[PDB]
Amino acid sequence: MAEKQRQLKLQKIYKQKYIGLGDESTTREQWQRNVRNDTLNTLQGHSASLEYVSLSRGDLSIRDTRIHLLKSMSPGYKAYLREE
Protein backbone atom coordinates (compact mmCIF):
# COMPACT_ATOMS: atom_id res chain seq x y z
CA MET A 1 0.00 0.00 0.00
CA ALA A 2 2.71 2.44 1.08
CA GLU A 3 4.95 1.21 -1.74
CA LYS A 4 2.28 1.09 -4.44
CA GLN A 5 1.41 4.71 -3.78
CA ARG A 6 5.02 5.76 -4.10
CA GLN A 7 4.91 4.10 -7.50
CA LEU A 8 2.12 6.43 -8.63
CA LYS A 9 4.12 9.40 -7.45
CA LEU A 10 7.15 8.55 -9.60
CA GLN A 11 4.95 7.73 -12.58
CA LYS A 12 3.62 11.27 -12.70
CA ILE A 13 7.10 12.70 -12.18
CA TYR A 14 8.72 10.60 -14.88
CA LYS A 15 5.94 11.23 -17.37
CA GLN A 16 6.46 14.97 -17.01
CA LYS A 17 10.16 14.75 -17.78
CA TYR A 18 10.17 12.15 -20.49
CA ILE A 19 6.80 12.97 -22.00
CA GLY A 20 5.57 9.69 -23.37
CA LEU A 21 5.42 6.83 -20.86
CA GLY A 22 2.40 4.66 -21.44
CA ASP A 23 0.72 3.60 -18.31
CA GLU A 24 -1.91 0.95 -18.61
CA SER A 25 -4.85 2.38 -20.49
CA THR A 26 -3.31 4.28 -23.32
CA THR A 27 -5.17 4.95 -26.42
CA ARG A 28 -3.61 3.57 -29.52
CA GLU A 29 -4.03 7.11 -30.80
CA GLN A 30 -2.01 8.32 -27.84
CA TRP A 31 0.79 5.77 -28.11
CA GLN A 32 1.25 6.16 -31.83
CA ARG A 33 1.92 9.87 -31.57
CA ASN A 34 4.80 9.26 -29.19
CA VAL A 35 6.25 6.83 -31.67
CA ARG A 36 5.90 9.47 -34.40
CA ASN A 37 7.52 12.26 -32.41
CA ASP A 38 10.58 10.23 -31.41
CA THR A 39 11.27 9.22 -35.00
CA LEU A 40 10.99 12.82 -36.14
CA ASN A 41 13.28 13.90 -33.32
CA THR A 42 15.89 11.25 -34.17
CA LEU A 43 15.71 11.77 -37.92
CA GLN A 44 16.48 15.46 -37.63
CA GLY A 45 18.95 15.04 -34.71
CA HIS A 46 21.74 12.99 -36.16
CA SER A 47 23.56 14.81 -38.92
CA ALA A 48 23.72 11.68 -41.10
CA SER A 49 20.08 10.98 -40.89
CA LEU A 50 19.18 14.55 -41.81
CA GLU A 51 21.35 14.38 -44.96
CA TYR A 52 20.01 10.97 -46.03
CA VAL A 53 16.49 12.29 -45.80
CA SER A 54 17.33 15.59 -47.46
CA LEU A 55 19.04 14.03 -50.45
CA SER A 56 16.35 11.40 -50.85
CA ARG A 57 13.62 14.05 -50.83
CA GLY A 58 15.64 16.23 -53.17
CA ASP A 59 14.76 19.12 -50.85
CA LEU A 60 16.69 22.28 -51.76
CA SER A 61 18.35 23.01 -48.43
CA ILE A 62 19.17 20.70 -45.54
CA ARG A 63 17.59 23.27 -43.25
CA ASP A 64 14.18 23.03 -44.89
CA THR A 65 14.06 19.30 -44.33
CA ARG A 66 14.75 19.96 -40.67
CA ILE A 67 11.69 22.21 -40.44
CA HIS A 68 9.64 19.78 -42.49
CA LEU A 69 10.43 17.35 -39.69
CA LEU A 70 9.52 19.69 -36.85
CA LYS A 71 6.27 20.97 -38.28
CA SER A 72 5.35 17.28 -38.70
CA MET A 73 5.44 17.00 -34.94
CA SER A 74 2.19 19.06 -35.15
CA PRO A 75 -1.00 17.26 -36.16
CA GLY A 76 -2.18 20.11 -38.41
CA TYR A 77 0.80 19.94 -40.75
CA LYS A 78 -1.02 17.41 -42.94
CA ALA A 79 -3.87 19.88 -43.38
CA TYR A 80 -1.49 22.77 -43.85
CA LEU A 81 0.24 21.14 -46.81
CA ARG A 82 -3.08 20.29 -48.44
CA GLU A 83 -4.26 23.91 -48.43
CA GLU A 84 -1.10 25.23 -50.14
Partner 1 sequence: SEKISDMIMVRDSSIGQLNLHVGLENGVYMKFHIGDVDGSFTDIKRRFLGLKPVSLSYLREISKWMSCVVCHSSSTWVSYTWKNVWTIRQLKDQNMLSCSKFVNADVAINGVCSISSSGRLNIGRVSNFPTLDNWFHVHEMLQISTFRPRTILSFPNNPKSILFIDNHSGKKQCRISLQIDGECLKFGSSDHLYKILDDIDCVSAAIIDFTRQADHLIICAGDKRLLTYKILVNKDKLSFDIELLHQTEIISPIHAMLKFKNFLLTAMGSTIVLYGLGKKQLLRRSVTQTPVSITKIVSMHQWNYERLAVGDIHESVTLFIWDPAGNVFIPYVDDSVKRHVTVLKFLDEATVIGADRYGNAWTLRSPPECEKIMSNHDPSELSNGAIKYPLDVITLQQKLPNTYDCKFKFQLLNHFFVNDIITDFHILDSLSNSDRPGCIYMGLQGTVGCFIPLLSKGNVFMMGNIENIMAEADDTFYLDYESRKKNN
Partner 2 sequence: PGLFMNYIWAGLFHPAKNVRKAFWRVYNNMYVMYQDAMVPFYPVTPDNNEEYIEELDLVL
Partner 3 sequence: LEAGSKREQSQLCVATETHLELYDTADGELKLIAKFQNLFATITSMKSLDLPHWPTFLALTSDSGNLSIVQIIMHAGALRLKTLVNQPLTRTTLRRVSPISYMEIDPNGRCIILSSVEQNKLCFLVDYAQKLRISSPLEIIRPHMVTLDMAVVDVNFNNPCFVTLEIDNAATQLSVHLIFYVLELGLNHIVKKADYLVNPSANFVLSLPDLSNPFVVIGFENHILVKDMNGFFSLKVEIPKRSITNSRHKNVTIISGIVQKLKNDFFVLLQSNHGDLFKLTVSPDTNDRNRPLVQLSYFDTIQNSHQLHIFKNGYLFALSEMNNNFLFQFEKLGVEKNDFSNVLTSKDPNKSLVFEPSIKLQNLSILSQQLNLNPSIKSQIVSDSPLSIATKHFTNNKIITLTNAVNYSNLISTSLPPNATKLWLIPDPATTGDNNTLLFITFPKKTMIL
Q: Round to whole Å and give the CA distance between 68 and 42.
A: 13
For residue 27, the one-letter residue type is T
Binding partner 1 (rule: CB under 8 A), the pick from 48, 79, 82, 83 is 48
The site map against partner 2 for 16-55 (x = CB under 8 A) is --x-xxxxx-x-x---x--xx-xxxxxx-x------xx-x
Closest contact distance (angstroms) between CB of 25 and partner 1 is 27
Instruction: Convert residues 57-76 into a mask of x (bound to partner 3 by CB under 8 A) and - (unbound).
Output: -xxxxxxx--x--xx-xxxx
Are 75 and 50 in contact by the 8 Å Cβ rule? The answer is no
- DSSP assignment of 16-37 equals HHHS----SS--HHHHHHHHHH
Residue 8 near which of partner 3, partner 1, partner 2, none (CB within 5-8 Å, type-dependent): none
